Symmetry: C4
Subunit: 464 residues, 4 copies
C-alpha cells in the first residue's frame, strides 16, 4: 500500500511524461481553446457580419425606424399601421434599385407547406371574434385562421379588433465578400427575414419588429483549416482517453481504499471526507471530458442539426479552460512555493456556505418586498424579473442613483407609498452593505482566521 500512498502523494517526476500528456492537453486543450477563439474570432466577425446585416435589414425594411427605437417601435393608428406595411411592401418591390447591397431571392417558400413568395404577407385572426365592449360582451372562437397573400418578386386590410398578428416573410441571398480581407473565400448567405406586427395584447399598441435567421454555406463552385480542426478533435479524443485511464487508476485506488479501510481490521467506517480537496484530479478530468465530448459533438453528430447545439456546446468548453485555466495554475503552482493562496479558499465555503444561505434568506425577504412594492410605480421592479435586477443595485453603483432618487420625485401616487417607498427602499440599501463586507470580512477575518492558522492520510505519513 506504500506505493499507493506514494501515488496519492504524486515533484514526483523530479523524484523520478504522464504530466506531459496532462501538460499536452492544456496545450492540447489550450490549443483547442485557441482554435475556439480563432473559431470564435471568425464567428464574431461573421458575428460582425450578422450584426451589420441586422442593422441594415432593420433600416432597409423599416419605415420611421430610429436607433434606440427598437424598445418602442410600434404602430398606433390604422393609418399608422398601414404605412409601414406598405413601406415594407415597397422594399420587396424596389430592392434591386435602392439597396447598397446585392441581394438575390428565389423560391424558398414558407412556412406552411408551399410554395413561393418570395415573402408571404400573412394575417392571423380568431375564426370567430364578436367583440362588443359597449355591451360588455363578446363571443369568441379562438381558433386562429391564417390568411396569406403571395407576392412574387419582379393593399390588404384586416379589421383591427380582428388582428392577432400580421407577418411578412421573405428570403434574400447575398455573398459575404468581406471574407477576402481575412484571406478567405467569400461565403454564400441566405437571410430569412420575418417582420412581425404583433397585436396579441389587443392593447391599441402594435409593436413592429424584424428578425433574421442566417443559413451559411459554400458558394456553388469551389480543407486545410478543416483538416486541422479534425486533428484537434482527434487530439481531444486522446485526452479524453487519458482521462478515462486516470479515472480508472483513481477507481482502483478507491477500491483499495474501500477495501483498505474495511480490509485491514474488517475496518469501519466510511468517511465523506468533507471537501476533500485538492479536488480536480478527478473532478477536473470529467469536466474536461464533457468539454472534450462536446467539441466533437458540435463538430460531429448534432452539428448535422446546427444552431442551438453548436452554441450550447461552446459553453461547456469554457468550463474546461478556466478549469483548464484553473488546473494548470494548481499544477502550475507546484505547491506554489507551499500553495498558500490555494488553502485560503477552502475554509471559507464551510462557513460561507452557511453564511450564503442565511444571506439568501435575508435576501429572499428583500426580494419579496420587491414583488409587492413594485407594481404601483417604476418599471425596474415588476417581476422576479426586475426583482432579480435590483439585486444588482445593492452591490453596485449604477442602480442606486437612478431608482432611489428618480423614484423619490417619483411616478409616486399614494401619499403613504411615497412615504412607503423611501421607508423600505432606504431600509434596503443599508442592511446588506454593512453586513456584506463582514460576511466577506468575518470570513475575511475568518480567512485571516484561516490566515491566523495560515500566517505561520496523516497516519500513512507518520508511517512513512
Amino acid at each position: 500500500t506504500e506505493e499507493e500512498d506514494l501515488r496519492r502523494r504524486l515533484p514526483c517526476d523530479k523524484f523520478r511524461r504522464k504530466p506531459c500528456k496532462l501538460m499536452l492537453q492544456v496545450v492540447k486543450i489550450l490549443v483547442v481553446t485557441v482554435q475556439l477563439i480563432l473559431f470564435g474570432l471568425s464567428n464574431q466577425l461573421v458575428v460582425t457580419f450578422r450584426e451589420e446585416n441586422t442593422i441594415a435589414f432593420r433600416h432597409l425594411f423599416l419605415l420611421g425606424y430610429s436607433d434606440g427605437s427598437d424598445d418602442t417601435f410600434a404602430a398606433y393608428t390604422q393609418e399608422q399601421l398601414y404605412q409601414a406595411i406598405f413601406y415594407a411592401v415597397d422594399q420587396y418591390l424596389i430592392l434591386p434599385e435602392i439597396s447598397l447591397g446585392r441581394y438575390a431571392y428565389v423560391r424558398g417558400g414558407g412556412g406552411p407547406w408551399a410554395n413561393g413568395s418570395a415573402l408571404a404577407l400573412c394575417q392571423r385572426y380568431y375564426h370567430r371574434g364578436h367583440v362588443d365592449p359597449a355591451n360588455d360582451t363578446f363571443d369568441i372562437d379562438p381558433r386562429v385562421v391564417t390568411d396569406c397573400i403571395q407576392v412574387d418578386p419582379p393593399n390588404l386590410t384586416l379589421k383591427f379588433h380582428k388582428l392577432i398578428n400580421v407577418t411578412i416573410h421573405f428570403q434574400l441571398k447575398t455573398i459575404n465578400l468581406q471574407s477576402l480581407i481575412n484571406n478567405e473565400i467569400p461565403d454564400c448567405y441566405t437571410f430569412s427575414i420575418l417582420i412581425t406586427f404583433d397585436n396579441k395584447a389587443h392593447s391599441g399598441r402594435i409593436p413592429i419588429r424584424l428578425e433574421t435567421k442566417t443559413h451559411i454555406q459554400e458558394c456553388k463552385h469551389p480543407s486545410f483549416r478543416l483538416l486541422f480542426d479534425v486533428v484537434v478533435i482527434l487530439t481531444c479524443s486522446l485526452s479524453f482517453l487519458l482521462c478515462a485511464r486516470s479515472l480508472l487508476r483513481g477507481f482502483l485506488l478507491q477500491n483499495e481504499f474501500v477495501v483498505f479501510m474495511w480490509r485491514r481490521r474488517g475496518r469501519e467506517i466510511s468517511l465523506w471526507e468533507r471537501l476533500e480537496f485538492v479536488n480536480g484530479w478527478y473532478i477536473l478530468l470529467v469536466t474536461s471530458d464533457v468539454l472534450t465530448i462536446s467539441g466533437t459533438v458540435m463538430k460531429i453528430g448534432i452539428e448535422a442539426k446546427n444552431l442551438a447545439s453548436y452554441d450550447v456546446c461552446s459553453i461547456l468548453l469554457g468550463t474546461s479552460t478556466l478549469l483548464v485555466w484553473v488546473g494548470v495554475i494548481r499544477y502550475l503552482t507546484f505547491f506554489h512555493k507551499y500553495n498558500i493562496l490555494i488553502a485560503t479558499l477552502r475554509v471559507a465555503l464551510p462557513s460561507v456556505m452557511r453564511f450564503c444561505c442565511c444571506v439568501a434568506v435575508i435576501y429572499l425577504g428583500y426580494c419579496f418586498c420587491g414583488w409587492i412594492v413594485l407594481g404601483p410605480y417604476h418599471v425596474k421592479f415588476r417581476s422576479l424579473s426586475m426583482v432579480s435586477e435590483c439585486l444588482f443595485s445593492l452591490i453596485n453603483g449604477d442602480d442606486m442613483f437612478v431608482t432611489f432618487a428618480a423614484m423619490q420625485a417619483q411616478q409616486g401616487h399614494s401619499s403613504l407609498v411615497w412615504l412607503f417607498s423611501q421607508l423600505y427602499l432606504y431600509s434596503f440599501i443599508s442592511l446588506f452593505i454593512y453586513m456584506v463586507l463582514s460576511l466577506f470580512i468575518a470570513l475575511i477575518t475568518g480567512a485571516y482566521d484561516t490566515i491566523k492558522h495560515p500566517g505561520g492520510e496523516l497516519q500513512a505519513y507518520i508511517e512513512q
Copy 2:
C-alpha cells in the same frame, strides 16, 4: 418550574405537531405568499395592462407628446396652449375612427354633481383677479370659480393671467381581452381620464399631464380561484389563532417569571434583558398576525372601499414572509449546526446603534451643507428632497461622476462658490468613505471581536 425551563429550551420534538402548525403556516403562510405572488403576477400583467393603457392614452390624447418628454411636456404660448386643447378635443370627437382600440363611453358624469359629458372641459380662475405688474399692484379675490363646458360624444378661451388651471375629464370603457392568454374571462374596464393644463405657478410655463384611474369589474353577462383565496384566508385565521394561543402560553410563562423572580424570595429585581433574542418566537407571531389580519382585511371589510387599502395591506404581508422567510431559517437552522451566523448579528447593534447615531450626527451636518449650498447651482440638491438623494451618492457610484464633475465646469457663477463647491463637496466624499468600512470594519473587527469570542437562565441550566 423545571417543566417551564424545558419549555423555554424547546430538537425538543425529537426528544419526544405544534411545529407542523408553525410549519404549516409558513407553507400556509408561504402558500398565501404564493397566492399573493400569483395575485401579484396577475396584477402586474393587469398592472401590465394598466401601463400599456397609460402609454396609449398619453399618446392618444396628447399632441406633440414625446417619450421622456413627460418631465418637460408643457405649453408656452397661447397659440401653444390652444393647440393641445383643440388636439385633445379632437380625440374625443374622432376616437372611434382613429384608435387601434375599441372604447365605449356613456353617462359617467363628474366631478361636481351632474351630469353627462362624457368629458367636461373645465376652467378654474380667481373670482377677482386684477393683476397689474406695470404699476406693481394687484387686487385679488382668490376664491376659485369653475366654469365647465359639456361635450356630448357623437373653441373656448380663458385669459392667461386669469388661468389657474384647465382640466379635461372623460371616461372610456373597454374589454380586457388579453385575459384569454392566461385562460381567464375578459374583464370590463372603465378608464377615467383627466388631462390637466396646470397654471398654478403663473410662471409662463404650463405643464400638461394625463392621468387615469381604472375601475375593474366583471362584464355584464357571466368561483374556483375565489373560493381558493377564501380557503387561504380561513387558513390564515387559524394561524392567527395558533399565534394567539402561543402568545397566551408565553404570557403565562411571563407571569410565572414575573411571579417567579418575585415569588421565590419576594424576589427583585426586574431585568430589561437588553436584546433578549432569540426574539421572534413572540415578536414574529404578532407581525404574522398583522400580516394575517391585513390579508383578510384586504379581501374583506375595507376592500369594499378599494384602492389604497388593498395596496397598503400588501406591504404588511411582505414583512411576514421575510419575517416569514426569516423565521424559517432560524427554525430552519435548528441551531444551524450551532447557529454561528445568527450570533454574529446581535453584538453589533449594541455598538452599531451607538455608531449609527453619531454617523447620523456626522451625516446631519453633511445634510445641512446641502441645504445652504444647493440653491445656487444644480437641481440634484435643492430640498430635503434631493438632500436625501445625495445620501445615495456617497455610498454608491452612480452619483459621483455625474455631479462632482458636471458640477465643476458647472452652472457655476460666483468665483468663490466654484471655489466653494469643490471645497466642500470634495470634503464630503472622503470622510464617510474611510470611516464607513471601519464602522462596518470596526464592528466587522468587532464582529471579528464578536468572532474572536465567536471563532472558538444560566442558573437554571446549572440546576438542570
Copy 3:
C-alpha cells in the same frame, strides 16, 4: 488649583444653567438653523421661481433652442448668426402679444452710462483688425470698440472677422404671484436679461447664451417674520457673548496653566499637547461665533450690498450646525455611555494624516499622468480640471465603465497610445483600490488597533 481641575473635568451639573445657555444656543442655534432652512426653503421656492424664470427666458428669447442644447447651443453661419439675433429681436417687439406671462419693462438703461432701451443691441470689435491669413499676416489694434443700437419698446451687420462679441441687454418686470400659495404678499421682480453671442475664440463657432440677474423688492403699495428674524439675530449675539465669556474663562485657565506649569517649580516645559481633544469646547465656540457673526452680517451691513455676500455667509452657518450638530452629540453623548465611538476617530489621523500625504503623493503622480495623456484623446481629461474629475472615477463606479471602455475603442489614433491608454489607465484603477481599503483597513485594523486597546492631567487625577 483643585477647583480648576474640577472645571476642566466639567455630569458636573448633576453633581450640583450654563449648559442651558449652551443648550439654548443649539436650540437657539438650532432654531436659527431652522430659520435658515425656512429662509432656505423660501429661497429655494423663490429659487424655484428663478429656475422657472430662467428656463422660460431661454425658451422665450432663444430660437432653435433645445433642452440639453445649452452645452452646444451656437451659430455656425452668418445666415445662422443673423436669425437668432433677429429672433431675439422679435421677442422684444412682440412679447405682450405672445408670452404666457405678464412682463413690463421701462427705463432701466445699461450698462455704459445712459439711457434707455430697454435693451441695447451692442457690438464689440477691435478698433483695428486687418486679418489676412492668405498672406499669413495681420495688423491689429486690440482696443475694443463698442457700438450699441438702442431699441425702444413699442437689421445691423458686423463683419465676422470683426466680431468679438454681440450682446443684447434688456430688463423686464413681473409680479411673483406664486407667493399667494405660501400665504405671502406677491413680490416685485425686475429681471435683467443678457444674451451673448460670443466670438472671443474666433473659431468659426459662436456659442449663444442667455443669463438673468434678479432684483427683488416689495411692490409699490403695502414685519412679523422680519421681526422674528431680528429677534433670532439678537439671540445669536447673546450666544456669541456667552462664547466670549467662556473663552475668557478658558484663557484664565490657560494663564493658570501657563502660570501653573511654570509657576510651581519655575516649571518647564511647554507641551503642544498634540491633538489635545476633546477639542470643541473652545474651537467650536469660535466657529459658532463666526457663524453667528455672519448671520448678523448677512442680515445687516454688507446686506446693503446684497448678493454674493448673502450666499457666502450662509456657507459659514453650515459649519456651526454640523459643528452645531456635532457638538450636541458629544455634549449629547454625555460620555455616550463611555464615549467609545468618539475615541475611535483620534488615533487614525495621527497615522492617517501621514498616510494621506503619501497617498496624495502617490496621487500626485497619478494626476500628472493625466496632464500628459489627456490632450490626445477624450474630453474627460484635459486640465487640472478634469484631472480632478478623474479622482472621482477611481473611488466610485460612474466613471469606470464610461471612460475605460469608451476610451478603448476610442477616438484613439496613435497605435502606441491605444497601446498606451490601456497600459496606464489600467495601471491606474488597480493601485489605489487594493491600497485604499488597507489605508482605511490598516487604519481600520489600526482602528481595531485603536479597537484592540479600545475593545477592552493624569497627575492631577492621581492627586484627587
Copy 4:
C-alpha cells in the same frame, strides 16, 4: 569599508549639497514638469483650438451630421450616398461665402505624386470585380485602382458593388488668433482634411468620417520662452550627469560588495536580495535619465520628425514626476518619522504577487467565458476587446446595472441562453467581489500582519 557602510546609511548631511542637486532636480525636474504643464496647458488650449476646429470641420463639411451621430454617421442608399458627396463638394465651392472662419487654401497636392486640387475626389475599386451572388460566383482581381478627380478652388458615379472607398482630400490654412488672449503671436495653421466614405465591408452600410491633421508654424513675417526651454533642457542634462555620477558611485560600491562578499573569505555566496528596497536610489535615477533623455529628444533630434515622437516622449516624463513625485516624499519622509507607511507596501507584493497570478488565473477563465458567451447577444462583450471592458464591470458600478439587467430582458434568443446568460453572468459578479477584499483584506490583514509586526547589513550595524 566602514566608510562604505556609512555611505549606504546616508540625516547624514545633518551629521555633516549633493542633496541640493538631487533637491534641485526635482525642482529642476519639478520645474521642467512645470514647463511641461505650461507646455501642456498651451497645447491643451491649442489642443482646445484643435478640438474646436474638428467640431467645426465636421459640421462644416458634413451633411445631415448630428452630435453623437459620429458613432453611426453613414450612407445607406445611392441616393443617400451621393448627397453628402455633393454636400461635401458644395463646401469646397462656397466656403468663403458661408463659413464663420477665414480659410485660405492653395497648392498642397496629395497624396499620390502631384499636383494641386486643392482637394482630390478619389475612387478606389477592384481592378476586376465580377460579383454575382445570384449564381453564387464571383471573379476578382483584388488589385486596387485609384481614380481621382481634381477640383480647383474658384457629378461622378462609381458602381456600388465596385466601391472600396471614396475619399475627399483638401487643405485649408487659417490664422490662430485666439493666441492674443494668452498674449502670444497668432500661429499659422494648415489643416489637412480627409473625408472617407468607407465601403471596405461591402455591407450595404457606408460609414462617413472626417479627420484632420494640423501643421503648425510661425506666420510669414516676424526667443524668450524658447530660450527658457533650452535652459531647462540644459539643466536636465546636468541632472542626468549627476545621476550617472551617482550611478558610478553605486557601481563602485557594488564592486566593493562584489569584491567584499567574495574578498574577505574568498567569500560566497551571492544574494538576490529579493526586493532589496528601499529601491529608487538607483532605479529612480535611471528612469529620471530616461525622462531627461526624452525631453531633450522631443525638443531635439526626432522633433525634426514631429508628431508621434513628441507625444510618446511626454509619457516618459510622467513616470519621473510621480517617480519624481514619489522619490521626494521618500526623501521627503526623511524616515517620515520612522517611515511606517513606506514599510507597509513591501510585504504585500511578495504575497500579493502570488495572489495576483492566481487571480489572473481565476480571471483568465472568467475572461474566456466572455469569448464564448458574447457573440450571441450584446455588443459589450464581443472581442478581447470588450472582454477587457467587462473587467471594469466587476470592480465598479457603472457596468453592473446596464448589462446585467439590460441583458436579462435581452436581445436574448435561445431559451437556454437566457437561462444561460443569468446562470453565468450572475456567477461572475459574486466570486471576485467576496474574494477581492480578502485579497486586499487578507493582505490587508496581512498588512495588519505586516501591521502586527508593524504596529509595535545587520552584521555591519552590529560591528558599528
